Amino acid sequence: NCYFPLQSYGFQPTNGVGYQPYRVVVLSFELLHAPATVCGPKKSTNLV
Amino acid sequence: QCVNLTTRTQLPPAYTNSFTRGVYYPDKVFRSSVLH
Numbered sequence: 001n002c003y004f005p006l007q008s009y010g011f012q013p014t015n016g017v018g019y020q021p022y023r024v025v026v027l028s029f030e031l032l033h034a035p036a037t038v039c040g041p042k043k044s045t046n047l048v
Numbered sequence: 049q050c051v052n053l054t055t056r057t058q059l060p061p062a063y064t065n066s067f068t069r070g071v072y073y074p075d076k077v078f079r080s081s082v083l084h
């Protein structure tokens with residue numbers, strides 16, 4: 001009852017949906033609580 | 049490379065009074081004339 005803590009995944013192309021593998025990305029970002037560095041594709045305009 | 053310079057006298061904890069230090073700007077925003 002002492003175990004190597006970490007396991008393989010059984011990923012065969014015969015796996016059913018949901019037992020099949022998925023690639024995952026999580027996008028994390030804070031908003032408006034500093035100066036900023038990544039932005040959406042919008043044209044600026046002059047200062048009025 | 050590194051070496052254990054273990055010639056070190058086993059001095060006790062030493063202490064001083066941190067009267068009013070370690071205050072820091074709590075968030076990345078501007079404020080003025082206000083008790084926040």
Ligand SMILES: *[C@@H]1O[C@H](CO)[C@@H](O[C@@H]2O[C@H](CO)[C@@H](O)[C@H](O)[C@H]2NC(C)=O)[C@H](O)[C@H]1NC(C)=O
Binds near residue numbers: 050051052054
């Ligand atoms: C400096 O001295 C310390 C002991 O005060 C050394 O620590 C030992 O290091 C070995 C491996 O090299 C461990 O097997 C021992 O368990 C350690 N001792 C203790 C009490 O735990 C240290 O390696 C020395 N380092 C050098 C650069 O000489």
